[PDB]
RNA sequence: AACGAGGAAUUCCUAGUAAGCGCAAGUCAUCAGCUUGCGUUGAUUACGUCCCUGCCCUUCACAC
């Protein structure tokens, strides 16, 4: 489960997302765009969530054959997303396109 | 190469109640249920047991049959769909009483013990488990519409209406939306009990169907439609 | 789904008062009702006689 | 029953 | 003598007395600054006059408001009514009447209750 | 109040009825004041819609 | 597509059911065109109704 | 109305005072040369100015906005405003 | 061209927070949301969804129950706050409703960067049922704009209240979710589903 | 054992109203198993119609 709290207000919980049944090791907000939140889990799919729509991922990147524990957003390239798995492969994705297959 | 769920242990599906209104469901409303109580002790009025008594109340003994309501509840609750937790049952007594039937309840199989439970239910307005953890049968406030899911299709069982494949009907229906089937437990009468709530009426077979066989036929179609098995 | 059995009393009579696990508890509750009924009736009678 | 105006429309 | 005016605002049992004089922009309620008025959620309500006509007009006057009776909300409404009436009266007496007319126009355009009492007298039916 | 309730489509029907009455001179003079009051009220109430219509047959009837 | 019509007259003595008001509305798209409709809520002149159907003509609902 | 007094400066600024209290209320700065004429209509809505720079400024007195600006061939020397007819004549240097 | 109205800096002997001075510049709801850019998208709802007069706080103490159509002039935010307090246990507690609405607008701005007042207006505009039924069976009739506004507010508030009746979510967050979903027009919002069911039933008996 | 906001039926209610909160007094009848005052916070929905149900009324110009 992914929990979004108001910083400096631990009591309030704004949004709660059940990203996957497996552990969710990485949860990182997109730098350029505020609404979209990225999540990578041991399910090996790095879902891109939207704060407004928490019921379904906006995009569900796949293709990693191992645990994905690393996620990075490239500055000046909001469409690009970088993920690194224990495969030893760093996979780069383009969110503008259909996605789900690394460029 | 989609990965497996983290835990594959069998998990009991949630018990679906009136409080939850989003989950897809197939609701059966056994309208025109003949369930009445009267002191001789109080006994559920029956078409054969109490004929002279019902004559004194002036009601015709043709429509004094709670066994039909007993029959439908047995096949509905024992159907695999209920065992899958996708079905909840409501009962609208002819007098105008609305009863909620929790999917967990295990009604007695013998009709005599069934009658003893209803007189308890109508007077005490609720039935609790032997272990006293939940309320299985509860009387609720009319109309049925508020209790029903917010987005929901409504239909009735009509002999005169066009015959439809129940399996096909559920398939073409939406996913977030739920389906309510108003079954007439009455032995005979005009099929207009639920006309105020329902928007369309459908038939299941060319030949006449009882309340019990009809609902059993309906549910089995849903199981194939949703692959409940 | 878990399956539970309904709890009901056979030959139920709502006019008849609820069965109680403890006989002494029922017997005193039986009787506190009797004392209240008798006290209210006699008080009504003595008032009416006085009037 | 029918009201004035409603009757006239029928006529 | 220092030019000064006195006005009353009223809401249910709450009554506020405002004294407005020549000064340096000192607004106080019950001996404390206006910024400390409570409840905080309704504080901007009592700010409504100050903001509607602009703080520049108050830079040349001192206002002292004393409030008694009623509850929190009625006290707030009494304070704002008293402040508005005091400002209008001071501009009437010791400043041009043109500014008086502008102040009255602004207050009436925003909320007439700032100047005229809101009295819910019973009306049988 | 009865005349106002009629939709416009019935006003054209009403205007065809009065035209038929005009040929029968016996009826026209028998109820001439009544015919005038109803006709003028109908024209006044929905004058705007009547003038908008471009029906040539309508223009001849009113003439 | 749904049309918008402005109420020009609130008819009276129509014999309508309780809470239902019969009104006359002119289409914003075509000001000349008018249609008689039935309204459920409180209605006055110059307010705009969203007509889903523009061909049905109102009848008394008793 | 007799409430406002308008002063035109040789440096081009128009200052507006209140006659009752003598307090400066507004200051208009459009002209860069001397203002040789100021006038306000009877309705206290539209205000007109002229200066040696040759421009005729039209202001909305109540909203304090520049309605328009008109340039003439020669410097303007004097103004007379007729309030009833909303006509004003300007004596140019030509 | 310059017009000068202040010729000396204004400093008051009583300190005032600067934010209150930027509020002097313009009236904003809770000193945080501007009314300038808010418009009612649906033409019919105009003249009944009142947003033209900016207000600092929802509390107004106005008299809107006197005449038949005074409720139209009441600010829409205040009508939402008033509808928020029901069920008896909340009756008379308007300050708590104001706080809930403040928190809800903050949540709405957080989740979606749009102006929260615009989101509220969009939700009310969308969730107003345009065609309804009257019992005779049923017969289809039109709905007045005032009834549309009333039913929209009632549906939104009832959905928000029921969603968090016995749930870990609080009233503010569920109200924010309902408002955002209704503004989008998605079927997730309870009010949108109720409106769609009403209009569908009216179409059936048309 | 009992219970987790209360079924069927039925009643009342239009603005400082419904509802919530507390503080006083006990004023020759009534009231303390309580009664009457006082202030505080304060809404939703209608303010139209005779369609249904009851009660009621009717059968000095000009213009009609």
mmCIF file of N, CA and C in Angstrom, chain B residues 28-82:
data_model
loop_
_atom_site.group_PDB
_atom_site.id
_atom_site.type_symbol
_atom_site.label_atom_id
_atom_site.label_comp_id
_atom_site.label_asym_id
_atom_site.label_seq_id
_atom_site.Cartn_x
_atom_site.Cartn_y
_atom_site.Cartn_z
ATOM 1 N N UNK B 28 -31.827 -10.643 -5.334
ATOM 2 C CA UNK B 28 -33.111 -11.288 -5.578
ATOM 3 C C UNK B 28 -34.093 -10.773 -4.538
ATOM 4 N N UNK B 29 -35.208 -10.219 -5.003
ATOM 5 C CA UNK B 29 -36.245 -9.672 -4.138
ATOM 6 C C UNK B 29 -37.466 -10.573 -4.260
ATOM 7 N N UNK B 30 -37.701 -11.403 -3.243
ATOM 8 C CA UNK B 30 -38.830 -12.333 -3.242
ATOM 9 C C UNK B 30 -40.080 -11.566 -2.820
ATOM 10 N N UNK B 31 -40.618 -10.799 -3.762
ATOM 11 C CA UNK B 31 -41.787 -9.984 -3.482
ATOM 12 C C UNK B 31 -43.024 -10.857 -3.292
ATOM 13 N N UNK B 32 -44.056 -10.256 -2.697
ATOM 14 C CA UNK B 32 -45.327 -10.935 -2.442
ATOM 15 C C UNK B 32 -45.120 -12.214 -1.634
ATOM 16 N N UNK B 33 -44.211 -12.156 -0.668
ATOM 17 C CA UNK B 33 -44.039 -13.247 0.279
ATOM 18 C C UNK B 33 -45.178 -13.222 1.289
ATOM 19 N N UNK B 34 -45.812 -14.374 1.498
ATOM 20 C CA UNK B 34 -46.950 -14.492 2.409
ATOM 21 C C UNK B 34 -46.428 -14.994 3.751
ATOM 22 N N UNK B 35 -46.050 -14.054 4.616
ATOM 23 C CA UNK B 35 -45.534 -14.353 5.950
ATOM 24 C C UNK B 35 -46.321 -13.523 6.954
ATOM 25 N N UNK B 36 -47.226 -14.170 7.689
ATOM 26 C CA UNK B 36 -48.048 -13.495 8.683
ATOM 27 C C UNK B 36 -48.111 -14.340 9.947
ATOM 28 N N UNK B 37 -48.279 -13.665 11.082
ATOM 29 C CA UNK B 37 -48.302 -14.302 12.391
ATOM 30 C C UNK B 37 -49.616 -13.999 13.099
ATOM 31 N N UNK B 38 -50.075 -14.961 13.898
ATOM 32 C CA UNK B 38 -51.310 -14.808 14.650
ATOM 33 C C UNK B 38 -51.346 -15.841 15.768
ATOM 34 N N UNK B 39 -51.894 -15.442 16.914
ATOM 35 C CA UNK B 39 -51.937 -16.309 18.086
ATOM 36 C C UNK B 39 -53.118 -17.268 18.001
ATOM 37 N N UNK B 40 -52.874 -18.534 18.331
ATOM 38 C CA UNK B 40 -53.935 -19.535 18.380
ATOM 39 C C UNK B 40 -54.425 -19.690 19.815
ATOM 40 N N UNK B 41 -50.301 -19.718 21.314
ATOM 41 C CA UNK B 41 -49.000 -19.335 20.778
ATOM 42 C C UNK B 41 -49.144 -18.776 19.367
ATOM 43 N N UNK B 42 -48.124 -18.052 18.917
ATOM 44 C CA UNK B 42 -48.158 -17.443 17.595
ATOM 45 C C UNK B 42 -47.559 -18.387 16.562
ATOM 46 N N UNK B 43 -48.248 -18.523 15.432
ATOM 47 C CA UNK B 43 -47.871 -19.468 14.388
ATOM 48 C C UNK B 43 -47.877 -18.748 13.048
ATOM 49 N N UNK B 44 -46.866 -19.026 12.230
ATOM 50 C CA UNK B 44 -46.837 -18.514 10.867
ATOM 51 C C UNK B 44 -48.032 -19.066 10.103
ATOM 52 N N UNK B 45 -48.892 -18.177 9.616
ATOM 53 C CA UNK B 45 -50.102 -18.618 8.938
ATOM 54 C C UNK B 45 -49.749 -19.428 7.698
ATOM 55 N N UNK B 46 -50.398 -20.581 7.558
ATOM 56 C CA UNK B 46 -50.137 -21.512 6.472
ATOM 57 C C UNK B 46 -51.440 -21.828 5.754
ATOM 58 N N UNK B 47 -51.319 -22.156 4.468
ATOM 59 C CA UNK B 47 -52.504 -22.386 3.648
ATOM 60 C C UNK B 47 -53.280 -23.616 4.110
ATOM 61 N N UNK B 48 -52.581 -24.670 4.534
ATOM 62 C CA UNK B 48 -53.222 -25.921 4.938
ATOM 63 C C UNK B 48 -53.390 -26.062 6.447
ATOM 64 N N UNK B 49 -52.379 -25.689 7.238
ATOM 65 C CA UNK B 49 -52.487 -25.855 8.686
ATOM 66 C C UNK B 49 -53.650 -25.053 9.253
ATOM 67 N N UNK B 50 -53.792 -23.801 8.831
ATOM 68 C CA UNK B 50 -54.764 -22.871 9.400
ATOM 69 C C UNK B 50 -55.667 -22.359 8.282
ATOM 70 N N UNK B 51 -56.730 -23.109 8.000
ATOM 71 C CA UNK B 51 -57.754 -22.697 7.048
ATOM 72 C C UNK B 51 -58.922 -21.992 7.721
ATOM 73 N N UNK B 52 -59.494 -22.601 8.761
ATOM 74 C CA UNK B 52 -60.581 -21.952 9.474
ATOM 75 C C UNK B 52 -60.154 -20.634 10.091
ATOM 76 N N UNK B 53 -58.960 -20.607 10.686
ATOM 77 C CA UNK B 53 -58.458 -19.363 11.260
ATOM 78 C C UNK B 53 -58.330 -18.277 10.202
ATOM 79 N N UNK B 54 -57.743 -18.604 9.050
ATOM 80 C CA UNK B 54 -57.522 -17.567 8.050
ATOM 81 C C UNK B 54 -58.851 -17.085 7.481
ATOM 82 N N UNK B 55 -59.836 -17.983 7.388
ATOM 83 C CA UNK B 55 -61.192 -17.570 7.045
ATOM 84 C C UNK B 55 -61.692 -16.496 8.003
ATOM 85 N N UNK B 56 -61.395 -16.644 9.296
ATOM 86 C CA UNK B 56 -61.824 -15.644 10.270
ATOM 87 C C UNK B 56 -61.145 -14.301 10.027
ATOM 88 N N UNK B 57 -59.851 -14.305 9.693
ATOM 89 C CA UNK B 57 -59.221 -13.063 9.256
ATOM 90 C C UNK B 57 -59.731 -12.607 7.894
ATOM 91 N N UNK B 58 -60.461 -13.459 7.177
ATOM 92 C CA UNK B 58 -61.082 -13.063 5.931
ATOM 93 C C UNK B 58 -60.184 -13.109 4.717
ATOM 94 N N UNK B 59 -58.933 -13.529 4.869
ATOM 95 C CA UNK B 59 -58.008 -13.605 3.751
ATOM 96 C C UNK B 59 -58.151 -14.952 3.051
ATOM 97 N N UNK B 60 -58.049 -14.930 1.724
ATOM 98 C CA UNK B 60 -58.220 -16.155 0.952
ATOM 99 C C UNK B 60 -57.037 -17.094 1.168
ATOM 100 N N UNK B 61 -57.341 -18.384 1.340
ATOM 101 C CA UNK B 61 -56.323 -19.394 1.635
ATOM 102 C C UNK B 61 -55.478 -19.783 0.433
ATOM 103 N N UNK B 62 -55.811 -19.312 -0.769
ATOM 104 C CA UNK B 62 -54.938 -19.562 -1.911
ATOM 105 C C UNK B 62 -53.589 -18.876 -1.721
ATOM 106 N N UNK B 63 -53.608 -17.623 -1.280
ATOM 107 C CA UNK B 63 -52.397 -16.834 -1.039
ATOM 108 C C UNK B 63 -51.992 -16.835 0.433
ATOM 109 N N UNK B 64 -51.795 -18.023 1.000
ATOM 110 C CA UNK B 64 -51.351 -18.177 2.384
ATOM 111 C C UNK B 64 -50.238 -19.209 2.464
ATOM 112 N N UNK B 65 -49.244 -19.080 1.589
ATOM 113 C CA UNK B 65 -48.233 -20.113 1.388
ATOM 114 C C UNK B 65 -46.838 -19.556 1.629
ATOM 115 N N UNK B 66 -46.299 -19.641 2.850
ATOM 116 C CA UNK B 66 -44.894 -19.265 3.056
ATOM 117 C C UNK B 66 -43.905 -20.320 2.594
ATOM 118 N N UNK B 67 -44.361 -21.537 2.285
ATOM 119 C CA UNK B 67 -43.440 -22.579 1.841
ATOM 120 C C UNK B 67 -42.776 -22.203 0.521
ATOM 121 N N UNK B 68 -43.491 -21.481 -0.344
ATOM 122 C CA UNK B 68 -42.887 -21.022 -1.591
ATOM 123 C C UNK B 68 -41.715 -20.098 -1.294
ATOM 124 N N UNK B 69 -41.883 -19.198 -0.324
ATOM 125 C CA UNK B 69 -40.771 -18.343 0.080
ATOM 126 C C UNK B 69 -39.652 -19.174 0.689
ATOM 127 N N UNK B 70 -40.011 -20.212 1.447
ATOM 128 C CA UNK B 70 -39.008 -21.138 1.955
ATOM 129 C C UNK B 70 -38.274 -21.824 0.811
ATOM 130 N N UNK B 71 -39.010 -22.232 -0.224
ATOM 131 C CA UNK B 71 -38.402 -22.969 -1.325
ATOM 132 C C UNK B 71 -37.340 -22.135 -2.029
ATOM 133 N N UNK B 72 -37.660 -20.878 -2.345
ATOM 134 C CA UNK B 72 -36.716 -20.031 -3.068
ATOM 135 C C UNK B 72 -35.468 -19.756 -2.242
ATOM 136 N N UNK B 73 -35.638 -19.494 -0.946
ATOM 137 C CA UNK B 73 -34.489 -19.175 -0.107
ATOM 138 C C UNK B 73 -33.508 -20.339 -0.059
ATOM 139 N N UNK B 74 -34.019 -21.571 -0.047
ATOM 140 C CA UNK B 74 -33.138 -22.734 -0.027
ATOM 141 C C UNK B 74 -32.260 -22.777 -1.268
ATOM 142 N N UNK B 75 -32.871 -22.670 -2.449
ATOM 143 C CA UNK B 75 -32.101 -22.794 -3.681
ATOM 144 C C UNK B 75 -31.217 -21.573 -3.908
ATOM 145 N N UNK B 76 -31.677 -20.390 -3.495
ATOM 146 C CA UNK B 76 -30.857 -19.192 -3.648
ATOM 147 C C UNK B 76 -29.621 -19.256 -2.761
ATOM 148 N N UNK B 77 -29.811 -19.545 -1.473
ATOM 149 C CA UNK B 77 -28.688 -19.531 -0.543
ATOM 150 C C UNK B 77 -27.733 -20.686 -0.813
ATOM 151 N N UNK B 78 -28.260 -21.832 -1.242
ATOM 152 C CA UNK B 78 -27.426 -22.986 -1.546
ATOM 153 C C UNK B 78 -26.786 -22.910 -2.924
ATOM 154 N N UNK B 79 -27.158 -21.931 -3.745
ATOM 155 C CA UNK B 79 -26.576 -21.824 -5.071
ATOM 156 C C UNK B 79 -25.091 -21.478 -4.962
ATOM 157 N N UNK B 80 -24.262 -21.927 -5.912
ATOM 158 C CA UNK B 80 -22.832 -21.589 -5.830
ATOM 159 C C UNK B 80 -22.562 -20.096 -5.844
ATOM 160 N N UNK B 81 -23.429 -19.296 -6.471
ATOM 161 C CA UNK B 81 -23.184 -17.858 -6.540
ATOM 162 C C UNK B 81 -23.148 -17.261 -5.140
ATOM 163 N N UNK B 82 -24.062 -17.691 -4.269
ATOM 164 C CA UNK B 82 -24.018 -17.240 -2.883
ATOM 165 C C UNK B 82 -22.734 -17.701 -2.208
#
